[PDB]
Design a protein around this ligand. Structure first.
Ligand SMILES: NC(=O)C1=CN([C@@H]2O[C@H](COP(=O)(O)OP(=O)(O)OC[C@H]3O[C@@H](n4cnc5c(N)ncnc54)[C@H](OP(=O)(O)O)[C@@H]3O)[C@@H](O)[C@H]2O)C=C[C@H]1SC[C@H](O)[C@@H](O)CS
Ligand SMILES: NC(=O)C1=CN([C@@H]2O[C@H](COP(=O)(O)OP(=O)(O)OC[C@H]3O[C@@H](n4cnc5c(N)ncnc54)[C@H](OP(=O)(O)O)[C@@H]3O)[C@@H](O)[C@H]2O)C=C[C@H]1SC[C@H](O)[C@@H](O)CS
Lengths: 329, 329
């Protein structure tokens, strides 16, 4: 804690007054059977932020790993930054507090550090005891059904959660800039964080610029582009040249004795965009944490900028073929 | 009125129950000194829809041209379809009815057929007697200032206008699909029309698909792409290959003995997207009206589809360099 180089301890000061680590551990598709051990060892290795969600179905296991490290005194609770996300089924204001209480109960925590609206999409509510996580289930087989709940109504409910301190900060995910522009017109509390798909194939620079100009922090997901989606046989990801072998990336990695993956992560964090790389592998765990001790050059950013092709892998358009979800159209 | 070919009489049935002509006359940059004569002669030539806006500054002259044709009995009022648009300064609900009354007073009409929210942008109100049209003026020199009025609040005010019948139908313009998706959650009356920039360089196909699937009609503007903007020395438009000389377009025009301009217009109207070509020239007036009597082929649509490059000329991002307006980011 005394070497004057960049490290995994660097943080962003949120507009709520709390610090958020720039580098955290992503929990999507972290396997249930081993998730607690993975989270515990990530804490041992030095991870302090964990990016969870109601949708991910491993909330209890994440909590077991956290509470093991807390019980052993490896870390204090206030050193950890726990993020969760309100799923689409729970946008009705009357269900927002219920959803947070469910997260806290599952994770066996008194509070979470950041609660995000996971998507600007409002599914018909499904009771916890009918299906949890409900995922795409809307009470009627495979058919999607939706609730007429404007985003601002959900947001006002999220605002009330900060007052009791059970969610220290609140934010949004997968909102376009146009939606954020309208939301702030009705917001008493600005979102602290926007979390979005972000990688060199999908750079959305004007979204980044507008949102950061508002003092809203940005967290990138799927920083390795198509990689996260190969195991799901995402046809577009299967057909996309890997960022790990792309000549623009590898030639930059060659300059700094870093891996392509480390360049892809630092490309975000050096621009004050937080990252949450995911791995079930305890060997890339450390490489993904130690990305802030080198700097890309201005020419490197210029070169990486050329890769933008508006290639989006996580697009709800593909979920419901009867009622297309147009949040990124 | 008895030849069984497509013509300028074709219309779209709006979800409000009223018919809207597929081909109308656009009034942006129609010069004030000659606007009344131009509108009157357009009615003589057979135009029935006129696309006006508070921002355009020629509302009185448009009304003079209309009322001349009505006084001479060239047309009845119910044969005309008059569109106007609520400017950004008037999004506060208390100012929405005021704005419609201003339009009716200027145009000397009892009602308009379609009132659109011109942009999802809320400027600080400026009184009519201080500046009309206010354009970008927000009460403070060149500085922009804004109102914290969520779009749904403005929309509810537009909804009330339909009840008194002074606006037969209501709609929106320059809204992204994500904004429309949220608006419909709060709407009692769905928008009848979305009006957007639309041409082969900016095809936004998923926006078109989602919006039409909702039963909302679409009106294209700037169907000739960069052409409208050359007189304003729009640097991007000045650097853009004209659609009139683009080989994909000219080769299609060559098949049907039509001009490139006629192909560009029919490309929209054949897909049930209404068009509003503008001309101060009384000779292209007729060519722009007579576009529905030929059909493009499926291969032609395939070829024109390839021109899409997300090239947007009318982008409010460029208006305010201090507070970037991110509605299309
Ligand atoms: N807000 C949202 O909607 C979502 C948020 N997340 C969050 O982001 C975390 C990370 O994004 P991931 O998509 O999990 O993928 P990513 O980190 O890009 O890459 C993971 C894959 O890369 C391999 N890997 C890791 N480290 C590597 C190194 N150093 N070198 C090479 N390859 C590396 C991993 O393989 P191992 O596990 O075998 O190592 C992976 O294959 C997420 O975890 C989450 O916290 C992401 C997406 C969405 S939520 C998803 C969706 O919206 C659903 O909720 C609804 S359908
Ligand atoms: N909703 C909005 O925000 C806006 C709506 N409009 C509306 O659309 C009408 C038409 O779009 P235009 O931009 O006016 O331009 P367009 O018709 O594409 O082309 C006009 C130019 O093309 C030439 N021309 C006409 N006919 C031709 C033929 N047959 N062959 C070749 N060239 C042709 C014209 O030249 P002449 O006048 O010399 O013939 C033109 O040069 C608009 O009229 C309006 O009703 C459009 C834009 C926006 S509002 C604008 C902006 O948002 C401001 O309000 C705020 S900054």
């Amino acid at each position: 804690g005394l070497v004057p180089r960049g490290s995994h301890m660097m943080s962003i000061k949120l507009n709520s007054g709390y610090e958020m680590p720039l580098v955290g551990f992503g929990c999507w598709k972290v396997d249930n059977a081993t998730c607690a051990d993975t989270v515990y060892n990530a804490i041992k290795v030095g991870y302090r932020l964990f990016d969870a969600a109601m949708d991910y179905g491993n909330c209890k296991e994440i909590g077991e790993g956290i509470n093991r490290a807390l019980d052993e005194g490896l870390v204090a609770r206030d050193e950890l930054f726990i993020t969760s996300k309100l799923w689409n089924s729970y946008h009705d204001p009357k269900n927002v507090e219920l959803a947070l209480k469910k997260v806290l109960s599952d994770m066996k925590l008194d509070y979470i550090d950041l609660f995000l609206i996971h998507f600007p999409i409002a599914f018909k509510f499904v009771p916890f005891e009918e299906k949890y996580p409900p995922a795409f289930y809307c009470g009627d087989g495979d058919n999607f059904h939706y609730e007429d709940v404007p985003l601002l109504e959900t947001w006002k409910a999220m605002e009330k959660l900060t007052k009791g301190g059970k969610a220290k900060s609140i934010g949004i995910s997968n909102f376009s800039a146009a939606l954020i522009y309208d939301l702030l017109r009705g917001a008493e509390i600005k979102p602290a964080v926007l979390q979005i798909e972000h990688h060199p194939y999908l750079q959305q620079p004007r979204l980044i610029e507008y949102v950061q100009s508002q003092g809203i922090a940005i967290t990138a997901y799927s920083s390795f582009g198509p990689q996260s989606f190969l195991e799901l046989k995402h046809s577009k990801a299967l057909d996309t040249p890997t960022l790990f072998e792309h000549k623009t990336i590898t030639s930059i990695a060659d300059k700094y004795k870093k891996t392509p993956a480390q360049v892809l992560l630092r490309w975000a964090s050096q621009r004050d965009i937080a990252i949450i790389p995911k791995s079930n592998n305890p060997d890339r765990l450390l490489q993904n944490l130690e990305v802030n001790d080198f700097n890309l050059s201005k020419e490197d950013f210029d070169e990486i900028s050329k890769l933008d092709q508006d290639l989006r892998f996580n697009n709800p358009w593909d979920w419901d073929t009867k009622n297309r979800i147009p949040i990124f159209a």
